[PDB]
Structure formats: C-alpha cells, structure tokens
Amino acid sequence: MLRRQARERREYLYRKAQELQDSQLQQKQVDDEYAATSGIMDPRIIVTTSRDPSTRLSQFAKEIKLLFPNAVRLNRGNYVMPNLVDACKKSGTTDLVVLHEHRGVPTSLTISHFPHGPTAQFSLHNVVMRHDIINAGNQSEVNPHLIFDNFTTALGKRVVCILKHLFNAGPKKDSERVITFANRGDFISVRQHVYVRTREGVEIAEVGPRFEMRLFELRLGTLENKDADVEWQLRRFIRTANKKDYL
Amino acid sequence: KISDLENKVTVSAICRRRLPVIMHRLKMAETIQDAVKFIEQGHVRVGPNLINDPAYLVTRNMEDYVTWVDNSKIKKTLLRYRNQIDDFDFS
C-alpha cells in the first residue's frame, strides 16, 4: 500500500511538470488535480485546528466549517499528521483545513487538497469573528454564490482554483448567500453578505466573519509532506517586497 | 491520444511490463536473469496468486501487489538481518 503512494507521487510530479511545460509553450483550463472531479463530485472538507486549541480557534474552526457547505469540524486532540492525512485520505476527504492562533487570535490558515496536493498556507490578519457580534442570529447554509475580483496573474488563477472547489457547484440562481474573495495587493478581503433584490437596485448585509489572507507557501503535496516540491513561495526579504504585488 | 499510440507503443514498453523486469526496478532481484530463477522456483506473488511464468506482464493495477510468498525461505532472510523476523506470521 505504501507502494501505491510512492508511485503516484512520481506520476503527479510528472503531470505537473508536463502541464507546466505546456503552459509555458502556450505562453510563448482547470488544474490537473481538480480537473478529474471539478463539477462532478461535491467537495468533502475537514476543518481542524492545532493541538490544545484555545476556545476562539474552536469557534473560529466552527465558523470556517459554516462558511463551506460541505465542511465538518474535527478536534485535533493528540493526532499525528501522517495519521491525520491518512485518516482523512481514508474517509474520502477532498481538502483539509488547519487553523493556528496566538492567544486566541487566529494567525494562519492552511489548505491541503487530496489525494495528492497542492497545499496552500494563508496568514490571517484583521480577523473579526461573528462571535464578536451581539444578537447576530443563525446563518443561511444554502450553496452560496461566489465572487472572485482582481485575480489576473497565473498564480492568481491557481489561488482561484484552490479556493474555488471548496464549495458545492451549481447554486440556485436565486440562492441568497454570496461569498466574495477580493485581492487588493495580495490582500484577499473575504466577506459574507446576504442580499435582497429591490425594485431599483440591491442591498447587502454582512454576515461575517471578516478576515484577510496572504498566501505565503504553495507545495506539490499534502501538508504532512514537508519534503514536497515547492511550486511557489512568498519571499519577503527582497528590497521590492515593500511594493510588489502578485495576485 | 491515438496519434501517440502509433509511436508511443514500442517493444521496450511491453518488456518493461514483464515481471522479472518489474522485480528488477522494484529491486527485488539484482539482475534480470536472477529474477527469472526466483519466478521459476516460486518465491513471488502478484496479488493473491503465485505466478511461475517469467513472460507474464504485470498490469498497472497489480504492479504494487507483486511481492514475495509468505513462506519464502528468502523472505525469512529479509527479516533475519534486519531482525524483524516475526514467527507468528510464519515469516
């Protein structure tokens, strides 16, 4: 059984290399990982946290569960990542979400796509929980409408695809829930709004949470594989880091 | 694609799928000639069944269940040096 995963990774890295060459030749569709299941099989998502999580990360994990229609929350009590990925690979999970915190302030978010990657890590800034809202009420859990704005570069289309397939495909045209991911200088602003179509326009109301991401690491493999070949990194110490934009 | 089948298909490809060749790539046998004897003597299993024919080509879905028979005297040697020989399994 180890020889199944040992072989296919070589197939996976070979496929990405061939796809990269084809794209470069075109430079002179959906990604291969998602091409198989895009628009056919609805995503299966596991949301977990780091060990001994503070209360906020447990609630914040509960929130990230609510954002994605097919997400389920899992406690990380004493689990080991090779056991986690194998166990989540075992249940048919499509993606795994891990959350990190600092004094109950969420700091990072990592997404690993199954069976064979990629793994994207995010840094959480200006996080505003809905638990910080009095009398907020309960959500709508319909398949949400989805907005991607200000994504131009090839890396942007990749980040689009990774975040794209976390949701179910084919929402109803009158589905009332909209999710927006907006890049503003690598600053992906995320809001959850709910509307009503009026006789002379549209009015939207924030549901939350509010929280910003910067991508900083994309690798060809599961989050456990720290030896996975790296597609891209945020390389912060360059003199142009203070003014460069990627997405 | 079909236009690739006309040129991708070659005799070496079918030879690569041959069982002793696969054993050599899996490193079970040091040399192709060596792998043939082990197959002839019956120390190799591809999934549930032992195969005695060196000319067998292993299909893609069977190629990772190719392994040694449980009671191979050589499979004992595998575990004897590493000192992982567990005799409850009879191996």
Binding site: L2, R3, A6, N225, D227 | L26, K27, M28, E30, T67, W68, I74, K75, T77, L78, R80, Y81, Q84
Partner: peptide, 19 residues
C-alpha cells in the same frame, strides 16, 4: 535522505542480507 527514508519498501532484498 528524508524523502528517500520516507519511501522505504520493507521488502528490499540483497545477497549480503545473509551475513
């Protein structure tokens, strides 16, 4: 050495195994 150490087949045999 790590990824290589990860991808061990436990069934690897060599004639020096005997000694």
């Amino acid at each position: 050495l790590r990824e290589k150490a990860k991808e061990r087949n436990p069934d690897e045999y060599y004639h020096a195994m005997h000694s």
